[PDB]
Amino acid sequence: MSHSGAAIFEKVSGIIAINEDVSPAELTWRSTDGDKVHTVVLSTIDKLQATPASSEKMMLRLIGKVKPQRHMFSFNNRTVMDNIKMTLQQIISRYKDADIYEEKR
Amino acid sequence: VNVNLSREKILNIFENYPIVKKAYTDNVPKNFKEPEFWARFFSSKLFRK
Amino acid sequence: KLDRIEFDPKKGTFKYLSTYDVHSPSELLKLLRSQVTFKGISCKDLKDGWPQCDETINQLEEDSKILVLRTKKDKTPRYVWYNSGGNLKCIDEEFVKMWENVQLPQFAELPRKLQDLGLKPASVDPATIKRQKGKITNTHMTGILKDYSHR
Amino acid sequence: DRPIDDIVKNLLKFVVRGFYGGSFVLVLDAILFHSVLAEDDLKQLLSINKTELGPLIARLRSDRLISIHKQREYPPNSKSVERVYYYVKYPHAIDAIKWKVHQVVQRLKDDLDKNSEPNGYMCPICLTKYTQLEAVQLLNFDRTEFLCSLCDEPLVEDDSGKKNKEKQDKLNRLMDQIQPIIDSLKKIDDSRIEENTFEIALARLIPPQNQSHAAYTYNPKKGSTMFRPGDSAPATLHINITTASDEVAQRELQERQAEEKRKQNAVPEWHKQSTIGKTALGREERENEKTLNDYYAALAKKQALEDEFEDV
Ligand SMILES: [Zn+2]
């Protein structure tokens, strides 16, 4: 699917999930054993960084809008990374538009 | 792609399509703001159908 | 302060807190189903806090609800897994031995042999996988001319 | 996971549980629960030794129910090591299952045919079997007994006379027990399964451990023409709600655009007038509203980490 896949967070392997049902959409990374859990509210993300397709690394960082908070995820298969990046692009763009509409109004 | 909407058109969409109003009245103040709602509506298959 | 002890404020007692609170086959069957990996849960720590577990674990092996890895010295349960499949014993040994005697052909020659008997082969022979001027005039426009060769 | 993938998985599960021992179920179920799973991780998940995982992996490899993938890995702070991964290549496993199912039934059917034929003969001493035709050229001068050639001893009738019914019983049992495989293969033939690769399998990976030493990644070497045997397989939408004040603003912008377009086409000045004589070219109501509002109010009352990156 396009909402889950294996990911590495802080050198810990786990499953990254994109929760769209609960507003605002939040990204949850859960360690394999469940000892570690991380959650980021996508309303806070400003830009979405991603390593180029011409590099052996498969990282994907979500910089937080304001020492701004930064969340970096490393993937295993690029297809999973692309399918996760594509869904994130929609959420970040939409929330950026919402902020633009709110500030303008 | 940028699409422009107006209050008159918003009312017209509700009048000609009661389902859109049904999905509008129950969600605008509860979960997400109107700009997000209409952004979702056009992307949905409902707007295509 | 320790984590292996549970406090009871109703009476003010300290009770032991087992790793997996399992004292019934139903609890074990759901705990094994809830595992997010295929890491089996040891019977050594399952047996702790549960008076009898070999009696219960063996009963589920016969019913094919769980998978058991047993010791070689004497048959004794170790790490167990949930049996996501069907019956654990469904074929007589007269056919297991026959299945062991059949030797598959050379891989690249298998699809052809299956295609001669009339069975559709879900593979192909890998051999078929086809792995797929001079002197310029004006140069004062050094870095301006973009190559619009096609339209 | 596609619905056919479940059918293939169930077929593999049934075959392993019915035609292989206990530990085989553990090994294959582990790499069916997970995608490609490193050998070290596989050992850690089942808590079995190398000398015990060996026979299991070897047999599941000979039958092509499991595929192997070796690649060089370069940990940033350790000696480069070659890691081994195990996954399932569904087109390969299904062909092996189909061939083995056919062969087992064929062998039993042939044994039924052979067992229904005349018995034959054997020599008790030299343990050499003689067929009905071969025994008829050895009988003594008295036409009473069949004599052996090496031993010159009477022959003894062979067995398999009574098994005429048992072999049919065996076939009757097998087809009943092997029924799920036949039913699953029928559904598989209808659909088309895609061949799996180490990289493709990595897309469905469920990590086994928090800090596995094996890097579950496939970074193929650059411009490597080397080919190994059996290593190849066959927008944004933005919306804007326009208010009345925005509508008039948009109209003003449209008017400005039209004005600019008109200028782009208008003729210059020198072409407009004949330039002969000119020199040559060269180097208060608010209070009224309130008293009304109060008056009407009275009325109504009365009435009631630095790496290269891009931007996506
Ligand atoms: Zn003889």
Swiss-Prot record, chain A:
Family designation: Belongs to the TFB1 family.
Name of the protein in its database record: General transcription and DNA repair factor IIH subunit TFB1
Subunit (UniProt): Component of the 7-subunit TFIIH core complex composed of XPB/SSL2, XPD/RAD3, SSL1, TFB1, TFB2, TFB4 and TFB5, which is active in NER. The core complex associates with the 3-subunit CTD-kinase module TFIIK composed of CCL1, KIN28 and TFB3 to form the 10-subunit holoenzyme (holo-TFIIH) active in transcription. An additionnal subunit, TFB6, plays a role in the dissociation of the SSL2 helicase from TFIIH after transcription initiation. TFB1 interacts with XPC/RAD4. XPC/RAD4 recruits TFIIH to the NER machinery. Interacts with the NER 3'-endonuclease XPG/RAD2.
Misc remark: Present with 5150 molecules/cell in log phase SD medium.
Gene name in the database record: TFB1
UniProt-annotated location(s): Nucleus
Reported function: Component of the general transcription and DNA repair factor IIH (TFIIH) core complex, which is involved in general and transcription-coupled nucleotide excision repair (NER) of damaged DNA and, when complexed to TFIIK, in RNA transcription by RNA polymerase II. In NER, TFIIH acts by opening DNA around the lesion to allow the excision of the damaged oligonucleotide and its replacement by a new DNA fragment. In transcription, TFIIH has an essential role in transcription initiation.
Membrane-spanning parts: none
UniProtKB/Swiss-Prot annotation, chain C:
Misc. remarks from the entry: Present with 1150 molecules/cell in log phase SD medium.
Transmembrane segments: none
Described function: Recruits TFIIH to the initiation complex and stimulates the RNA polymerase II C-terminal domain kinase and DNA-dependent ATPase activities of TFIIH. Both TFIIH and TFIIE are required for promoter clearance by RNA polymerase.
Coverage span on the entire protein: 165 to 327 of 328
Subcellular location: Nucleus
Gene this protein is translated from: TFA2
Subunit structure: TFIIE is a tetramer of two alpha (TFA1) and two beta (TFA2) subunits.
UniProt similarity note: Belongs to the TFIIE beta subunit family.
Identification of the protein by name: Transcription initiation factor IIE subunit beta
Biological source species: Saccharomyces cerevisiae (strain ATCC 204508 / S288c)
Highest taxon listed in the record's lineage: Eukaryota
From Swiss-Prot, chain D:
Main location: nucleus
Compositionally biased region (Basic and acidic residues): 251-263
The UniProt record lists the keyword Transcription regulation: yes
Name of the molecule in the record: Transcription initiation factor IIE subunit alpha
Domain (HTH TFE/IIEalpha-type): residue spans on this chain: 8-98
Compartment(s): Nucleus
Quaternary organization: TFIIE is a tetramer of two alpha (TFA1) and two beta (TFA2) subunits.
Record's GO cellular component terms: mitochondrion; nucleus; transcription factor TFIIE complex; transcription preinitiation complex
Biological process according to GO: transcription by RNA polymerase II; transcription initiation at RNA polymerase II promoter; transcription open complex formation at RNA polymerase II promoter
SMART domains: TFIIE (SM00531)
Family matches, as InterPro entries: TFE, TFIIE/TFIIEa_HTH, TFIIE_asu, TFIIEa/SarR/Rpc3_HTH_dom, Znf_RING/FYVE/PHD
Region (Disordered): 251-272
Family the UniProt entry places it in: Belongs to the TFIIE alpha subunit family.
Keywords annotated in UniProt: Metal-binding, Nucleus, Transcription, Transcription regulation, Zinc, Zinc-finger
Note: Present with 35900 molecules/cell in log phase SD medium.
Zinc-finger ranges (C4-type): 123-151
Gene Ontology terms, MF aspect: RNA polymerase II complex binding; zinc ion binding
Cleaved signal peptide residues: none
Job of this protein: Recruits TFIIH to the initiation complex and stimulates the RNA polymerase II C-terminal domain kinase and DNA-dependent ATPase activities of TFIIH. Both TFIIH and TFIIE are required for promoter clearance by RNA polymerase.
Tree of life domain: Eukaryota
